[PDB]
């Protein structure tokens, strides 16, 4: 029925992102309290999406 | 402690006037006193003639 008609839509789509830069990229702690020995833990990165 | 945009603050129960577990100890005393006073009534006072 709509061979030569126009069609328009209002649509919902899932949010999506890509990492375009990594910022304040690494933060660190030698956690030692209440451990058998010194341990290295990487704290949260910040991403610019 | 604040490093590189991440910060943390902690305030312990420790203080110059009272230790960190002082609340637990002081509640233990409150129970022991009630518990001990009541139990002494099971045995009673001591008497000796003279
Ligand atoms: Zn007696």
């Amino acid at each position: 029925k709509y061979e030569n008609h126009t069609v328009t839509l209002k649509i919902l789509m899932t949010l999506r992102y890509v990492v375009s830069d990594i910022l304040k990229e690494s933060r660190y702690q030698y956690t030692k309290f209440n451990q058998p020995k010194s341990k290295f833990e990487n704290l949260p990165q910040k991403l610019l999406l | 402690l604040e490093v590189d945009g991440i910060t943390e603050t902690i305030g312990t129960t420790q203080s110059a006037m009272y230790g960190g577990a002082s609340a637990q100890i002081l509640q233990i005393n409150e129970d022991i006193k009630e518990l001990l006073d009541g139990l002494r009534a099971y045995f009673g006072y001591n008497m000796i003639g003279l």
Side-chain angles (χ1 to χ4, degrees), chain A residues 25-38:
Chain A
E25 173 280 325
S26 177
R27 293 178 286 197
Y28 58 86
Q29 169 156 278
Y30 294 119
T31 192
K32 316 193 289 177
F33 172 83
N34 198 352
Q35 297 284 271
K37 60 197 75 179
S38 308

Side-chain angles (χ1 to χ4, degrees), chain B:
Chain B
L1 193 151
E2 177 162 320
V3 167
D4 199 13
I6 174 163
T7 310
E8 185 163 35
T9 314
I10 308 186
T12 74
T13 51
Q14 299 193 7
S15 174
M17 71 194 298
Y18 288 132
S22 58
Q24 292 80 0
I25 300 289
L26 183 53
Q27 176 51 210
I28 291 285
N29 293 336
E30 176 175 276
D31 184 34
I32 284 180
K33 291 296 185 179
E34 175 171 15
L35 182 58
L36 184 59
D37 298 341
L39 187 63
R40 280 175 175 162
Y42 185 86
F43 295 95
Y45 300 164
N46 303 291
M47 179 188 310
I48 203 69
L50 198 74

